[PDB]
């Protein structure tokens, strides 16, 4: 009869940057997503595989909550099947996804008048990303032929290039906080329902 910590992960101060997204396990509480859907602040609320009005009467097994910060035109890639420099180098969703994707327009918080460049994002990798797999490793990515000693310079670039968030920077480039839940409904008894 204790209500879930959707209070904690939503109105938090600093969301972690997208190259290292925090994974909050939520279990053994009662959920109420009517305080999530009926609040008209969320610009994007897409649920794949569950209907959004049907979100209440569903006994889950465990509900996770990924959360990060991305720019405006790259919130389209947080969905099963797309590609780009977010969805395969930073955060990859499987193509059997059974959760919901919630967004914002947090231009009020994560945007300084100079550069609020504390939200890093990955840009280069040797391969693509697995479904639901983060990579905090900051390795000097080569691009040509030489192995370059762990030294920056020619053909050896730092992978995490940062963002830049001015308050007058354009709607497709404004910082969008994203929290994406991932449900699960099998191979366990009922834990989360309300």
């Amino acid at each position: 009869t204790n209500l879930c910590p959707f209070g904690e992960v939503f109105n938090a101060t600093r969301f972690a940057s997208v190259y290292a997204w925090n994974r909050k396990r939520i279990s053994n509480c009662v959920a109420d997503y009517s305080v999530l859907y009926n609040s008209a602040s969320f610009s994007t609320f897409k649920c794949y595989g569950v209907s959004p009005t049907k979100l209440n009467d569903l006994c889950f097994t465990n509900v996770y909550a990924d959360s990060f910060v991305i720019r405006g035109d790259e919130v389209r890639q947080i969905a099963p099947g797309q590609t780009g420099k977010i969805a395969d180098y930073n955060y990859k969703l499987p193509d059997d996804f059974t959760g919901c994707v919630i967004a914002w327009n947090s231009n009020n918080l994560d945007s300084k008048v100079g550069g609020n460049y504390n939200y890093l994002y990955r840009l280069f990798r040797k391969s693509n990303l697995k479904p639901f797999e983060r990579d905090i490793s900051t390795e000097i990515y080569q691009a040509g032929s030489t192995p370059c000693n762990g030294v920056e310079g020619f053909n050896c670039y730092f992978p995490l290039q940062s963002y830049g968030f001015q308050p007058t920077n354009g709607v497709g480039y404004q910082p969008y906080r994203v929290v994406v839940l991932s449900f699960e409904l099998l191979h366990a008894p009922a834990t989360v329902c309300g």
Partner: antibody
Amino acid sequence: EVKLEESGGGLVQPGGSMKLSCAASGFTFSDAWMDWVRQSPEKGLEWVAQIRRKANNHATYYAESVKGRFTISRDDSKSSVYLQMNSLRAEDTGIYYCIRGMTYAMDFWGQGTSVTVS
Amino acid sequence: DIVMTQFQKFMSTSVGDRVSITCKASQNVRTAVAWYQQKPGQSPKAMIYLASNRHRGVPDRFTGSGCGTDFTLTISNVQCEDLADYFCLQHRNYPLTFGGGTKLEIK
């Protein structure tokens, strides 16, 4: 503001020697790998030389046609990259561009300097 | 050495259209190619670095992509501003080689 400008615009008879002087401004001149490209209406775009940043021993790499005739060296306190060419021939005509850093960001280019043999 | 083939020398599409310039290669240049625009009378500017990323200050019509050996640069709704020549430059081995060049004129 960042801008680059070259020097050494002249005609030499084949077999001469002339050093090009490319000055830079308005960026961290220490850690930047600065190259030189070649533009000519016969050859198209080629590539000439390259010197790298301070963390890589100021190394050098040359094209296969200018080996041993084209020495490039920099000094970051004077804020310039100097390309020295000796034993010039007829195919080394064209306009040379001194650029900031190739094949990455900060990829600024100069304006050019023609060197032509009579 | 690595030679890039760029065999389109004259391409002509009018305003608000689409045309693609392709840059064939000769060896396993993985993702390290670059695309250069040169308006006539000036220095060749920079468009694409490492074959898919985009510079700052350039419009969003310039979307180049490709891996393996054969890359391409696809422009969308080309204006009268983009009457220029497009060079492709690889950086895998140290004798860097530029492509041929492709000059553009509008109907």
